[PDB]
Amino acid sequence: IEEGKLVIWINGDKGYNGLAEVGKKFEKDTGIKVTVEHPDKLEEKFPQVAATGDGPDIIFWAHDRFGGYAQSGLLAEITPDKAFQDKLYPFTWDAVRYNGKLIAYPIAVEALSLIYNKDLLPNPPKTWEEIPALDKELKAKGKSALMFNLQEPYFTWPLIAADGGYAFKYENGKYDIKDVGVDNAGAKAGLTFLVDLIKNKHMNADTDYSIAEAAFNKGETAMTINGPWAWSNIDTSKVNYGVTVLPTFKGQPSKPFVGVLSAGINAASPNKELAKEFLENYLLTDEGLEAVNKDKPLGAVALKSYEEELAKDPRIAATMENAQKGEIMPNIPQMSAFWYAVRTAVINAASGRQTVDEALKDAQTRITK
16 A cells, blocks of 8 residues: 555656656755556546545646545645645646645646748737638738637637637536536627638638648648647648747637646545645645746646746747636536537538527536536
């Protein structure tokens, strides 16, 4: 049962070698050995082993998954003091709250961004309203203004939400599941703008992840909407790109979904005090984030001090800025309803199969059912 050591689980696509290095430092001033592993589908495996009082002491995963884990009582409640709390961006603490209780620490933040071709576009548009006009100017040269994944709501939400949409009303570490914002005027304004893009041929209704990505990378389109995971692909492409704040819509900022990497302690661990000490005083320090980051970049981080160092790269700063304006993803189980419903509403409104008013009225209905 572990007991006198620390076992940590983190995905293979993360800086687990850097995390193993923070661990060697911990083992130095403590004698406690830390063990880092990155098992396959660990987020699937966690719930299974933890339900039987097994698994790692600590688990790293995006915050959204923590809601389901917490529901089943798999995570220990955390109690950083005020002082520790002030070391991180306030908005990040909202991501790791499960019905008022703090159930994890936030490490890393990723958010969608406006990516643009500096050779085709001098200055990115500040507004969504000016894209149509820009597209007609670019079309004059055989280029298009923007191409992004229209198929998944994760990608279209920034625009839909801009003027007032939200998944679930949040107001106290708690989500009101009967306060859904997919059918308001806000969301209606947004989806309508999107639909108008497609019918006015500034955008194709069948643009997916692959298509927009290839298009941007081939220098065929001036802009794209993507996240930090896409950067390595653009580099390769040799496109002279920039990352910036998403455009505003109706004078209001876009409200993209933000994913926040978070780390939690197994409710079944006998080592919670060791975990909290490792996490608060070794890992969540400039030197801890740095050793990890050196192994594999974290993107924007929750620790204010280190983020300020990282922000010298404009891309991550832009992502952070978007994140701050962004909407904390619901952790809640009802979020599954939202994905399917809103997915359907958009493809339907986009393909003419249903009107905007209709498409959203329906989705609203299936979520609050």
